[PDB]
Symmetry: D3
Subunit: 240 residues, 6 copies
């Protein structure tokens, strides 16, 4: 009957993503659970579907100047090279240099939740990230450029249904720490910063969360490489 | 140097329990974390140290009359025989017949937190538990007696330091649904219902959480066996 | 919004079962895959949803008379007490005394696939099962009664849509080795041997696979206990 | 070509056991390794091939009188009901009431290694095992009878090749704490206490370790059930 | 006795490989199993013995032009960087850009099975592989060269026992999509494309599968690096 | 109460390290255990706290000239690229090219144990490490420089309490195979080769093992990258 079709493989992927997100919906809509655990579904989705070089967790982000971010619903980060991940008071705290992306998880896409997401990503981009020069056989490379951390918002239901209306809420200065580079409203659309247009774009889509996943894969491919971290800038806090 | 001593094996166990509970302390005392995740440390401790027939989780408890408990910080239950454990909105919901013990987790032992613990265990004991007759080769056994569910309170710091004062707050009608049968304040003491004295007893102890663990092991040994559950009393809720 | 409802917990369970079975549908309907791996979905479902005392696998069944069953799509069995499970030529072979249930997996419920399922379960019930007397503190118990092995058929689409028509194909002598005791057509109905009516019953149901799961849980509860196996009756085949 | 044969399934099992034991041989024969880790192969074999109710480990055994066994190469024990297993100084220490069997691992079967094995099992049987009365719905059962702990010796090469000569070294008072109930020399034979003959029996066998495994399965089936342990007899050692 | 010898470490490795392949032999020779699962043994061997940067699975291979390979018995691929691996109808489908090697598994080395292997690898090399330019701190690197995918055949028994006769069947145009670069007949020999001779070479060897493993390790070392994949060339198939 | 402080996160890390090392202390001080398993605690610590690109094990090291090191208590090595790790006689044997660091584990820091550690690391640095030229798109890179293997000593109690006295025992020719580059005495201090001073430095520290961990992270960052290994130099030992 059915022969091999990439469109069917992608519909199957989308069906699995959609089924996992029903748990997010049920959590946010429950009068007792009230959204508890919702971000865990997205964390699990990213650990399932992203390349194995990436790890996802709910976490705080720290820097070597003793500054901390807000609690981040989903952080995508490195563990292959990263010198530490702190496990403290049942929380995870990740050095800022190891971070690729940060997301806020909400039920609905609207003005308040966009603002909330910007505050979260800004609290991560405000942190100081170290980067050492890199010795090699023929000399010393300049310090690696810092990762362009991806900021995003992950929601189920769009409450700004006109694309141009949503566009007006998403438009933001690309250089500002509160920039959102990607996001989705699973029932309706996804959005991203378009480097050609040099502007945010909203795409209505009937398989929005999977279109979002492919956009995220492409952005991760381009966001950079973790730096050689100044480990002693963190280690100096061991004693007064 | 050191030869084999059971007292040293038990001091080693106690040191491990005490080290794990520092995470509980740090969570409750943190101005941002504010106790988040604290019960997870106790859940992990019980899954480490209890016999493998027992499972521990943070969970809600349900019955076949569509009644639900409050959220329980630590539930000790059966998975070997139990017909289902629901995974809903990132929560676990356990049938009441599969429950052996329920605990409330707090930083401090005081009047308010005793009252809180009683309300939690009462919400579980109020549930209706089924028990079917048990056919066997020579006839039919009467339904298994229901488990005497153990209710408890798990804390770090005692704020009722006089044993007789704490006794006066713990005394309770053994037949009442709000009875607490066991508990501890890790820094000072543990307590339990003494079946010989027929009354609560407070024991000051320098290794209180490990003394508590041994008292819990003894109470679990005696609290009964899961019943043959009326599975269709739950299954009837599938359709209206 | 949503308060706690057992009907919602069961709808959530059903949604998860239904999502897993889409893989079975896609496998059977694919012009290259042609049903490969379909039974693995049901195996995984049973290992997820049955009590931990049960294990499920695709397997052959053997007896101590050197007789073997056909290949069984899903076998529910014991590993807690069972003296061996053979791992041979990438297949699993289970002693007959350790078996609780056997199922055939097909896309459709129709006459041919009922017949196929009967042949599979009959090949397991035809095997000789040992059972030793059981010494105890006060004497010796008679050998444990043999498990009433549950035979079933697991399908997605019903092609005998009239219940009375399907009934006429399912009716069978309860004592015969080809008896089917339970089954489902996920899109329409489930069926079982009703001990009160002493006859097969077909139940049209909008959540058929979950109604089936609860019927299976109830049948497993009653099908018996593994016997003390005559281990040397198997061990004698080691040498000629 | 090959049709289904239990003798072939058992030859396959035997081939796997034999391949695992080549590691034991290579360890004992190496001029640097000198037998290090040899018992780990047998531990792994038992955890692979015994029913899941059994656990195997290298361990010490303790009792509630603060007495300890020698280091035991392989202990078969319970974790399902057992109130504790101590993890101390990278060793495991198991309460005596939870023990089913104890084995000594050596390269060769000879007089010295039989004597060594007897000293090891005697150090376990000398321990005091508790057993409480067991309350039930209709009264109180007498304390469970203590397990008849199986003592054994596991070797690769027989240096007492005449069965009657080996018999003369194995004969022992069945009631004495140094009794060996089972053992093998993988290249030649296995041995066991025969309850009918009321005497040790040596069986020359070309698949000796697998014949041994089946004899062990049969002995485990009959050696008894763990008792209700006097938990407070251990807990009293927490403080002086 | 035995001191440290690399030849003994390699004989030990070879003994383990040979023991695992007895399962392949027993599967192919069984009148019911008829080779079912045989490739799983090789998959497991490669996941055990290859560097952790490599993954092995039975799988199909897809490209961004919606073209699919035949079913491949063993695919060696990347998961560290790869943007997706599809899990569809209980099959795995891997993007072509992530593939390092593909193998056909058969009982015997003969003309028909060489032809079969060529058809399988040709179906993978026929696929279109993308490769994007790679931005870096000082400019943009040309797209990464495509991996020289290794094609092979894995068998137990050689039926072309004369090396020059087997050579005549293996000789092939190195540039053609049906080229086989490596293979083995475990009982007799392994073969490979020799870059110095610029021709296939057959090596009779008494430890052929381990010699093959070392040749495979060397070929993997040289076959290239996964490209920056054109993720949107796959993502465009999400919608029509 | 407590707000976010990197010093508190690092104190928490240190508390966990200190608790794990109590097992090392208890092992070395026990009259029966006598240090058995002590290195396993450090192995576990490194697998917990080092970046995932590193693996730690107790192991021997081998080279392609058939030369072997002494048994090394803790080896830090690569598995991502490494062509083999031998599993022989329950030991691990690692090719020298894959090694980053080697450590000796002792209870006390004193002259004899420094000497012991030097002999261990010298036995690894004496091995021959291969390194092939590396083809690339534009030519062929010279062979990768060999890793500067880190040699160290891990102890609990300092018996050379004067830093200048300990300095006099640690001073060593940086180019010599017995150089120790890092170490700690958990109760008092850690030490390292200071590249600026070009000399060993001893640092008294109240959180010495965590200061050591950060120094180790920094040294690992700089010690180099595994080479392209001459796989056939090892494979030639397969046959005589």
């Amino acid at each position: 009957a059915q022969d091999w079709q990439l469109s069917e493989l992608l519909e199957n992927l989308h069906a699995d993503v959609q089924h996992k997100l029903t748990t997010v919906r049920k959590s946010f809509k429950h009068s007792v659970v009230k959204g508890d655990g919702a971000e865990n579904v997205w964390v699990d989705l990213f650990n399932q579907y992203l390349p194995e070089r990436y790890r996802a967790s709910r976490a705080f982000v720290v820097d070597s100047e003793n500054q901390f971010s807000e609690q981040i619903d989903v952080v995508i980060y490195d563990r292959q090279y990263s010198p530490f991940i702190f496990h403290y008071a049942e929380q995870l705290i990740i050095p800022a240099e190891s971070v690729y992306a940060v997301f806020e998880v909400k039920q609905t896409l609207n003005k308040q939740h966009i603002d909330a997401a910007r505050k979260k990503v800004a609290s991560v981009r405000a942190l100081h990230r170290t980067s050492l020069p890199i010795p090699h056989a023929g000399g010393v490379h300049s310090p690696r450029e810092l990762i362009g951390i991806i900021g995003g918002l992950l929601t189920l239901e769009n409450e700004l249904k006109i694309p141009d209306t949503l566009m007006g809420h998403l438009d933001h200065d690309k250089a500002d720490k509160g920039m959102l580079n990607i996001g989705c409203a699973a029932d309706d659309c996804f959005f991203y910063y378009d480097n050609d247009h040099q502007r945010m774009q909203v795409m209505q889509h009937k398989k929005a969360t999977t279109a979002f996943l492919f956009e995220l894969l492409s952005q991760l491919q381009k966001c950079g490489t973790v730096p050689m971290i100044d480990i002693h800038a963190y280690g100096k806090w061991l004693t007064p």
